[PDB]
Amino acid sequence: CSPGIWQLDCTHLEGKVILVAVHVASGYIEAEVIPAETGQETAYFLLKLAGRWPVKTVHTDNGSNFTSTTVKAACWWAGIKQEFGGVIESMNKELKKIIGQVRDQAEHLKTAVQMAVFIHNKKRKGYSAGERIVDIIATDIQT
Amino acid sequence: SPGIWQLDCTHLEGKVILVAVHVASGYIEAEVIPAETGQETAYFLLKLAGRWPVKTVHTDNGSNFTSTTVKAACWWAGIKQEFGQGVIESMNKELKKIIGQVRDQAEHLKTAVQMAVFIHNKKRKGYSAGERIVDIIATDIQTK
Amino acid sequence: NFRVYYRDSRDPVWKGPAKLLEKGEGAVVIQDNSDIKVVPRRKAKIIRDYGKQMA
Amino acid sequence: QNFRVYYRDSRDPVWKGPAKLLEKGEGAVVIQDNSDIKVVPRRKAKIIRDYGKQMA
Ligand SMILES: O=C(O)Cc1c(-c2ccccc2)c2cc(Cl)ccc2[nH]c1=O
Ligand SMILES: O=C(O)Cc1c(-c2ccccc2)c2cc(Cl)ccc2[nH]c1=O
Ligand SMILES: [Mg+2]
Ligand SMILES: [Mg+2]
């Protein structure tokens, strides 16, 4: 897979919206609890992600927040190609499993989400997802 | 060395911007946080610790950085704290400079902050800061 | 390098992306599909591939 | 080793600790803070493990 392809999707827990991004080639993920499942929140999440990693292509479903004009504006500003229409779907299930494992270690869901992201990215198989994405991108960097 | 970070807060438009810089690379991350508290600082650290190998954080003695909540987060994530160079202070000025250049391109400050972080990390020298941190960390992974 | 997003027919949702043809101090001239439109500056958002250029 | 407890007592809102975890009940926890043994209700105690540290 290309080092610049990401999949984004939303999942829900305890009445709150969780926006999840996965680097397809590595399995590395990032997640945020967002106050509303809107294009404004999705566009802000993408600009943060695009500043951290080389984000060239994002694949989402046709959720209204992902097709919003605000997201189109952010992707044009950051140089991100959008494509519409199971890695992230299975990742939502994996994230929810890890959240439940550590849920009692935190009062707020947002804390447990970031605990679960930590565990997912640091767990070794071997390399961890966090080690794989760093390795994949560094190899892609030209001399 | 690839796990050393400097964190500090700066202010614009009455709002608090929490900035983390990977000292060895100059790579930065920034968030506008609703309050300059240990609660918000600890949440920022847990997110940061999940992205990068964060082993040591250098801050000043701001109450949010010395708070018990942050000590709790650092204990959970395995982060060593050290208090009391100028890299982050000089980075706050650099970040504010880029924010003003792109401020009119966005209504909300939080949007301009993330535009400025993008520009700082993608700008070529040469390598960019975003390329350097990935290179530094990957080199420490592949050589072990 | 430029894409324009805009509002016009009393529709609050931002339309576009449109091609930027000319930029005046009070309005911009854009092309969306086969229709050429004149949009006031306050009702238009000219967005640059600014981050894209910093590659 | 693996557990640190932060707590509030004496009507003081600032979190004290870290304290050693002796026992965790559903209603209270038994802790030791610098030779002092204390019993603290669950809502006034936060038991934090180096879970991420060990998992990483
Ligand atoms: O419970 C939450 O979701 C986070 C949280 C923590 C905390 C921070 C890191 C790991 C686990 C919990 C906390 C910790 C202390 Cl020592 C005091 C107040 C605190 N208040 C909070 O809200
Ligand atoms: O102005 C902000 O701070 C972000 C923002 C954008 C925007 C997003 C990325 C780059 C530039 C502006 C926006 C864009 C459109 Cl086409 C419609 C509504 C919008 N509303 C917003 O709030
Ligand atoms: Mg979906
Ligand atoms: Mg400071």
Tokens of A98: 């890890």
Q: How far apart are CA A69 and CA B14, in angstroms?
A: 29
- Show the 3-state SS of chain A: CCCCEEEEEEEEECCEEEEEEEECCCCCEEEEEECCCCHHHHHHHHHHHHHHCCCCEEEECCCCCCCCHHHHHHHHHHCCEEEECCHHHHHHHHHHHHHHHHHHHCCCHHHHHHHHHHHHHHCECCCEHHHHHHHHHHHHCCC
Q: How far apart are CA C25 and CA B133, in angstroms?
A: 43
Q: How far apart are CA B75 and CA B49, in angstroms?
A: 12
Domain count, chain A: 1
Nearest CA in chain B to C47: B105
Answer yes or no: is C22 within a domain: yes
Of D56, C52, C8, C48, give the one whose Cα is nearest residue A122. Answer: D56
Counting Cβ atoms within 10 Å, is residue C37 exposed (0-12), middle (13-18) or buried (19+)? middle
Q: How far apart are CA B93 and CA B17, in angstroms?
A: 12
DSSP string for residues in B68-117: HHHHHHHHHHT-EEEE---HHHHHHHHHHHHHHHHGGG-SSHHHHHHHHH
Answer yes or no: is D33 within a domain: yes
Domain CATH for C33? 2.30.30.10
**Residue listed under structure tokens 């989402």:** A60
Answer yes or no: is C21 within a domain: yes
Contact: chain C with chain A (3+ CB pairs below 8 Å): yes
Answer yes or no: is C53 within a domain: no
Do the chains contact at C54 and B118, CB–CB below 8 Å? Answer: yes
Answer yes or no: is D56 within a domain: no
Of A25, A19, A33, give the one whose Cα is nearest residue A5. Answer: A25
Contact: chain D with chain C (3+ CB pairs below 8 Å): no
Q: Are A88 and A96 in contact (CB under 8 A)?
A: no
Answer yes or no: is C36 within a domain: yes
Interhelix angle A69-78/A39-52, rounded to 10 degrees, is: 20
Q: How far apart are CA A95 and CA A28, in angstroms?
A: 11
Of B46, B130, B31, give the one whose Cα is nearest residue A48. Answer: B31
Q: How far apart are CA A121 and CA A112, in angstroms?
A: 14
Q: How far apart are CA B95 and CA B31, in angstroms?
A: 12
Residue count (chain D): 56
A88 C-alpha to center of ligand 2: Å?
26
B69 C-alpha to center of ligand 1: Å?
6
Domain CATH for B97? 3.30.420.10
Elucidation technique:
X-ray
Range of the domain at C35: 2-48
Answer yes or no: is C54 within a domain: no
Return the residue whose CA atom lies nearest to atom 12 of ligand 1.
A106
* H helix and E strand count, chain B: 5, 5
Answer yes or no: is D45 within a domain: yes
Q: CA A54 → CA A78, A94, A95, A118, distances in Å?
A: 10, 24, 23, 20
Q: How far apart are CA C12 and CA A110, in angstroms?
A: 32
Pairing of strands B56-59, B80-83: parallel
Cβ of B75 less than 6 Å from ligand 1: no
B69 C-alpha to center of ligand 2: Å?
34
Tokens of A23: 């680097």
Tokens of A74: 């952010």
